[PDB]
C-alpha cells in the first residue's frame, strides 16, 4: 500500500505542485505543506530538553528511516540512544501537540550502518529505528515506498525533480508548519565541482544552478528527512534519498547532498528481515 496517500492518490486529487515533478520527467525558499501531503514524514524528538532533532520517514508500521548523523556524530559529542528520544508521526505543526492526530512512539533499538563514515564525508549516512509497537495508519500516517532497481534507474536522472520536506530552519526562524520544496537532480560532474568534499557513489546532489533563476534547499533541522519522487508508471511515491549534508543552505553554486537509498537497500533489507 506504500506511496499511495489517503488524502490524494486514493481520492484522485493531485497536490498543488506534483505536476511540476511529473513535467520534468521528459527548508529554504519552500512553501507551507498541505494537510496529508507527506504522511510518511516523521519528527525525531528529544525528551530532555524537548527539542526537534531531525526529520525521518515511516517505511512500515514498525520501522523508521533517518540519517545516521542525527544519532551519532562524535565531532559534536552526539551519541543519542533509545531512551533519549521519541518518534512523532502524523504531524503538520512543528511545536504543537496535535491531539488525536499525531502518534508518539518509543524505540526498541537503533541500527546504524556498520560502515557509516562520520570521520570524513558522511558516507553511508543512514540508520534504522525499530519502534516498540506498530503505529496504525490513518489519513495523516502512511508509509512511503523504497525503490526497486528499475524505478531508481528510470527516475534518478539529472534534470528530474524530487521533493524535500521538513521543519528545519527557513534561513541559514523555524516554520510554523511543515515546509516543502521541489528540486532538480544535478549532474554528478557539477556536484563534484562544487565542493572540496570527496563525493561517493552512495550520494547524489540536488538544487538549482545559479543561472536557472529558481532556488531552494534543505537546512539544519531537515536532516534525516526524505527526498521523494512520484513514479509516472504506477503513481506511487518512492523515497530516493535521505537529506544529508550541505555547506550552508541555499548558497549559490552549492547544492544539497543526499544519501542514495537504493545503493544501500540490501543493508536495509538485511537488518529488517534479521530483526523483524
Amino acid at each position: 500500500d506504500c506511496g499511495l496517500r489517503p488524502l490524494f492518490e486514493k481520492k484522485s486529487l493531485e497536490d498543488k505542485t506534483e505536476r511540476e515533478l511529473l513535467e520534468s520527467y521528459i527548508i529554504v525558499e519552500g512553501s507551507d505543506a498541505e494537510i496529508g501531503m507527506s504522511p510518511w514524514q516523521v519528527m525525531l524528538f528529544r525528551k530532555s530538553p524537548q527539542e526537534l532533532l531531525c526529520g525521518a520517514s515511516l517505511i512500515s508500521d514498525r520501522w523508521v528511516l533517518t540519517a545516521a548523523h542525527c544519532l551519532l556524530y562524535p565531532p559534536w559529542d552526539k551519541n543519542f540512544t533509545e531512551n533519549d528520544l521519541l518518534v512523532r508521526i502524523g504531524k503538520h505543526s512543528r511545536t504543537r501537540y496535535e491531539r488525536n492526530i499525531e502518534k508518539i512512539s518509543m524505540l526498541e533499538k537503533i541500527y546504524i550502518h556498520p560502515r557509516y563514515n562520520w570521520r570524513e564525508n558522511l558516507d553511508r549516512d543512514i540508520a534504522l529505528m525499530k519502534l516498540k509497537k506498530p503505529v496504525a495508519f490513518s489519513d495523516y500516517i502512511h508509509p512511503v515506498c523504497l525503490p526497486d532497481r528499475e524505478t531508481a534507474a528510470s527516475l534518478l536522472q539529472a534534470g528530474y525533480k524530487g521533493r524535500v520536506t521538513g521543519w528545519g530552519n527557513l534561513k541559514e526562524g523555524q516554520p510554523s508548519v511543515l515546509q516543502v520544496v521541489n528540486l532538480p537532480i544535478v549532474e554528478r560532474p557539477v556536484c563534484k565541482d562544487s565542493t572540496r568534499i570527496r563525493i561517493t557513489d552512495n550520494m547524489f546532489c540536488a538544487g538549482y544552478k545559479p543561472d536557472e533563476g529558481k532556488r531552494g534547499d534543505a537546512c539544519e533541522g531537515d536532516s534525516g528527512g526524505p527526498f521523494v519522487m512520484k513514479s509516472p508508471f504506477n503513481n506511487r511515491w518512492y523515497q530516493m534519498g535521505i537529506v544529508s549534508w550541505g555547506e550552508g543552505c541555499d548558497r549559490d553554486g552549492k547544492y544539497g547532498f543526499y544519501t542514495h537509498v537504493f545503493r544501500l537497500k540490501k543493508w536495509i533489507q538485511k537488518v529488517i528481515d534479521q530483526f523483524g
Binding site: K47, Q50, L86, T95, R96, I104
Partner: peptide, 11 residues
C-alpha cells in the same frame, strides 16, 4: 517553544 506532551510517553 514546543508544547508540553503527555507524560505517559515521557516515561
Amino acid at each position: 517553544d514546543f508544547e508540553e506532551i503527555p507524560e505517559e510517553y515521557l516515561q
